[PDB]
Amino acid sequence: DMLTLTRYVMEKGRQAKGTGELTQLLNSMLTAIKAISSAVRKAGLAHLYGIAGSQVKKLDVLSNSLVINMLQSSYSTCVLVSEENKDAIITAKEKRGKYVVCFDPLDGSSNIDCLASIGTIFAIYRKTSEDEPSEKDALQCGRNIVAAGYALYGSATLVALSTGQGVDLFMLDPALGEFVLVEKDVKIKKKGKIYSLNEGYAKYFDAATTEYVQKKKFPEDGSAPYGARYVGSMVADVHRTLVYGGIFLYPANQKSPKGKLRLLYECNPVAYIIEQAGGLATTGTQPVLDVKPEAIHQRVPLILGSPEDVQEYLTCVQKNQAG
Amino acid sequence: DMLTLTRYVMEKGRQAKGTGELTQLLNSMLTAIKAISSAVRKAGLAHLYGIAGSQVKKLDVLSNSLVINMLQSSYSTCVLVSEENKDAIITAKEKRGKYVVCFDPLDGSSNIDCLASIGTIFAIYRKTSEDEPSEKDALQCGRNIVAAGYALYGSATLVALSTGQGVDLFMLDPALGEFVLVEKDVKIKKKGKIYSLNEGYAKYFDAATTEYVQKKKFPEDGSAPYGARYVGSMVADVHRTLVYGGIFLYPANQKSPKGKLRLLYECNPVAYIIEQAGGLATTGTQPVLDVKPEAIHQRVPLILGSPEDVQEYLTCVQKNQAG
Amino acid sequence: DMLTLTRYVMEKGRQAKGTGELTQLLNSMLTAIKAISSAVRKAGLAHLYGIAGQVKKLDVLSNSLVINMLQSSYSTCVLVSEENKDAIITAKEKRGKYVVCFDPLDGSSNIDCLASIGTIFAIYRKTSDEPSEKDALQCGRNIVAAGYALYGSATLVALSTGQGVDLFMLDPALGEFVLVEKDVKIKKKGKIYSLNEGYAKYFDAATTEYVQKKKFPEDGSAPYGARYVGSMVADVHRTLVYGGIFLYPANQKSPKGKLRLLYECNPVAYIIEQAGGLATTGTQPVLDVKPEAIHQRVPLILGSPEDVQEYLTCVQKNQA
Amino acid sequence: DMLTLTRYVMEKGRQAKGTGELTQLLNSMLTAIKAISSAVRKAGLAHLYGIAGQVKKLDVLSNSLVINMLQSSYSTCVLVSEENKDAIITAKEKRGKYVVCFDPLDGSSNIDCLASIGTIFAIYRKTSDEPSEKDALQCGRNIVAAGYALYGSATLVALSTGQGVDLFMLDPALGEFVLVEKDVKIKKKGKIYSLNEGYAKYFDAATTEYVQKKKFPEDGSAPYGARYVGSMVADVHRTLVYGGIFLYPANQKSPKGKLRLLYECNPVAYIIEQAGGLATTGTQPVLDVKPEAIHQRVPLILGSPEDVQEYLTCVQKNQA
């Protein structure tokens, strides 16, 4: 149908009978994403190196400033939570709208020096309180998400987006400057053949994780072992899980007893995308989306992917937790 | 000094007192790399999806055709070996020059659908025979390399290049259309803290590999376990090894008794780069660069990286091989 | 505050309390423009020249881009293009209420010299019945939105929806048009005249007399400067931003004039008048001409209102 | 076969048996041009307009790009720029044998209207001593290489090193200039004249008479067409590719003419003559003018040789 993300998002807003407020917020985020893609790809690098006679922190700050300014100037927001800011950012009264956005503007930027795929992750909620906006409006369960997505700056730039009717994939055509729809209503495989986690924490794994990893490598059913992949950049690993199937894990371990990854702006957004595509996303003890947030930078364990694989992991957890 | 790869390569050719033949071959390869970067990033995708009213195999073929045509039309080549062609490609007599090029035009393209970082790898030799050019001119030991490099199409596009005086790193500024020098004479750390291999082959590992992996996760020296990373795209994993240190392994295993990766156009080029940067690259039994090629698509085991780490692995190999 | 043309257009649609149909049509046109800009700047040329082993092709491509984008908007019923003999009636399934007249790549006969070139469009609401060519034959007064893209040293769009003219520049690093000037107004009187004086031999007495007044003023003022790119969007845009006058009048060899009413003259007239200028055939304001045929030609004189009025005073004076 | 300007320039340097010094200088200029093109097309404009929270700036940027790239080539000793009062003497450490005269962004006074604009350059071998402004004051006959970049609907470079004129187009998707025409030749006689007729009141008798012959021919031929962009590289390029004549003669108000000898007139003269055309002050071929000062102005008439000769016949006829 609509070819471009811009038309697609407009048309979905029309079908939803929206007033245009979420459409503007979505357009704003996606413009920030284009601006980030351009910087990640190093447009203007020659000027930094003295072409006219004249780094990861800078790109983190820039990416964060793109997202904040684009979202605030949309007139659709009241509260923003960023991975880069300690406190919630309350939108000026004059520019205040309905929505709350939790985002990680440039996830993986610590490893930009090796040119690892990196990404931007976001989740959007409606403010449901009647009182003045505060960080509390950001502390909603992931079940309350109105829309969420991620951009992956990989070999090409892609956006995964859901507004509650499945997951759609769009790719940036840089010669045109627009995202183009490449797959509508993507569904994750019921069972995959890839497992994705940092095995350098094997020494610190719980009994469940140790058992599950052993069976990936040494199956007891006569099947071939699963392949391993782990980029170390969440968006890259989660996106491969979506398109190829299998499992991605960052469980609690002895040194990170609450996991590493952040509930509000990493794990909730990807849990929503993955469930929208027919997969599962769990902490090990409940769905990620059912965790009731206590603090805006809260960490949780994360296990997600193909439902048969996530079920297998959960079985290890229950078994090893039982008397 | 020279800022751009183009000036840098010209100036190195001048210092070497070359006739310009290798400079033209290098310029030609780097132009093909720019053209590949553009396609990998999906310029013109909107036209494929019907913007004017009207895939991995296609990009493989395109990338291969860019490299071949650019190299042949340079007038610097006599024989080319590509990962994509069964037989060696003999340059037409009218266009024949001195050099032989072994290349993998788009390494990792099988996994382009998940937007994994991918790359282009090449090694250049001088034809030393007096007889008519043939695949034999491509069967030289890696010790005979005149120049080699790789392009990584990651979050940004980078080229690593060596012509025998260390490794230089260049990044593509897309707004300018030139590669810019970002690090001259890069040296790999003597010891790192990352190990990189597919642990899904644990069931098939030799005793050496099993022992080495166990000590990465469970050290016997009171140190923290190494972190694990494995993108599954060789250029991405090798480049991270270079900039961050540590070890990358694709050893022989029970199902791939000669390894997986290709001697001529994957392993020799990266072995050369890694040794030029002060690391080690071994098959497990000898340096990669000392392997005497028997066939243009020969596979070898590959272990490379920081010298203290590669030494530790080699120690496991010797110990487990001994009576 | 909206910065981008996409947010600007969306916000104006929310203010109009529109259903989103025109907004989608404008988004579609603008996407076509960005695609045309990329092609005009010769993205992918190395592939044409055999790296992996034209003016007609680009006319056809640009026409196909605009047609496809407009039809797939679901907002159109009838299109008129400079490139097509007949009006294009949108398939029933994709039908909406708007009629678009456009020239997808004006000035392309001369691409060879790399002259600035452009895309020109006017949008009408269908009034009635069952769609046909007649729906495209409304006078310019009935325009709902119009503008142009100029592919010059940078790519710019001039757009009006009835509340003045806004200017947007394409940032090719972003892929978005950025608002650079809101509510632009033409100077009351300028210091530049613009016409092909190579047709002097064929001018009417009024044009001859006016041109002579520009070069040899009688009131002690400095003579006007001359500029004529020969590409209509470049010459019209310069007149908008610096002021003065632009003329392609009737002459002995082109008695109806050269420029096309539906997709050249009406759109630029609308923009120039929205900016406080005048646009006339020498008989009538362009926007009041009732069109007789989709590829009809008219004379065109437009620009700063005091300069156009001085010209009309010469036309009226020499009439008998 | 070489396809790219980088390979083309390299191969011509290998054929010349050069040491690589001029080749490096040309690579440096061309890189400056690509950088200027990106800026002119407004890459990064959204950042200027506050996305993350001008004509002078672009003149200065373009001048800095060219100066830096040329100086860091290690191929230059003296530079003359339109933007700098005095010649720039290259630091001893970076010194080479070439002298470059350039206008980094010609036409930029009028960026506002998005007119085509350009970069113009001429390269000389220093003859002697110890570098100074005098090294830049050689006549155009001594040029080793020259050309221009036009930032029009696409970005093009015209380059000659003494063996004719080759044309290259920038493919912005690749970041490389692609050879589009080798050894271009201007038509012997064209059908377009190009000058600002707004200075008619100040023309000499020869110019007045010539312009009248163009509009009112006596031999039954069709009158010439008029084009005048007001941006020198756009008007000169069109004359190269379509033929005819381009004039900025002396007039009462500009008795020395307007255009600058070292970095506007000599470079385009060289290209036009390399292409089989003529370039004259009306007194002398431009390339034979011995320069008196680095920012000196001269009259300029250039183009198809038969049109320039018809003009010179009017100059000589009206001399007394």
Ligand SMILES: Nc1ncnc2c1ncn2[C@@H]1O[C@H](COP(=O)(O)O)[C@@H](O)[C@H]1O
């Ligand atoms: N562009 C869109 N795509 C999908 N759903 C939308 C869109 N716009 C609005 N909606 C739905 O309508 C609700 C109200 O929209 P709004 O009136 O724009 O705040 C949102 O919270 C969404 O659930």
Ligand SMILES: Nc1ncnc2c1ncn2[C@@H]1O[C@H](COP(=O)(O)O)[C@@H](O)[C@H]1O
């Ligand atoms: N651009 C360059 N950079 C580094 N070394 C070069 C370059 N050009 C030539 N050489 C060296 O000189 C040898 C002969 O160059 P050629 O005469 O160009 O075939 C090469 O095989 C290189 O070892």
Ligand SMILES: Nc1ncnc2c1ncn2[C@@H]1O[C@H](COP(=O)(O)O)[C@@H](O)[C@H]1O
């Ligand atoms: N994006 C927009 N910008 C300015 N005016 C608009 C916009 N959308 C709609 N309008 C006005 O509202 C009318 C109806 O809009 P629509 O319901 O989309 O056909 C149009 O014909 C315009 O006059």
Ligand SMILES: Nc1ncnc2c1ncn2[C@@H]1O[C@H](COP(=O)(O)O)[C@@H](O)[C@H]1O
């Ligand atoms: N790239 C080139 N293209 C054409 N002619 C060249 C080139 N390089 C050098 N030449 C000619 O050879 C001379 C000496 O070159 P160089 O040794 O580089 O200063 C120049 O002044 C030119 O006349």
Ligand SMILES: O=P(O)(O)OC[C@H]1O[C@@](O)(CO)[C@@H](O)[C@@H]1O
């Ligand atoms: O090195 P570890 O501890 O395995 O961390 C990797 C994780 O941390 C990040 O926040 C850092 O890149 C995620 O993108 C990723 O999943």
Ligand SMILES: O=P(O)(O)OC[C@H]1O[C@@](O)(CO)[C@@H](O)[C@@H]1O
């Ligand atoms: O899935 P496995 O067997 O671990 O293969 C990965 C290797 O194979 C490739 O040829 C395929 O991407 C290399 O780029 C990479 O190192």
Ligand SMILES: O=P(O)(O)OC[C@H]1O[C@@](O)(CO)[C@@H](O)[C@@H]1O
């Ligand atoms: O050669 P002339 O007759 O002066 O034509 C110029 C006009 O023609 C065009 O349609 C281009 O050929 C317009 O863009 C321009 O104003």
Ligand SMILES: O=P(O)(O)OC[C@H]1O[C@@](O)(CO)[C@@H](O)[C@@H]1O
């Ligand atoms: O306004 P005029 O006097 O006709 O000036 C036009 C000339 O001036 C310029 O230097 C630009 O202002 C040239 O690019 C052009 O040919």
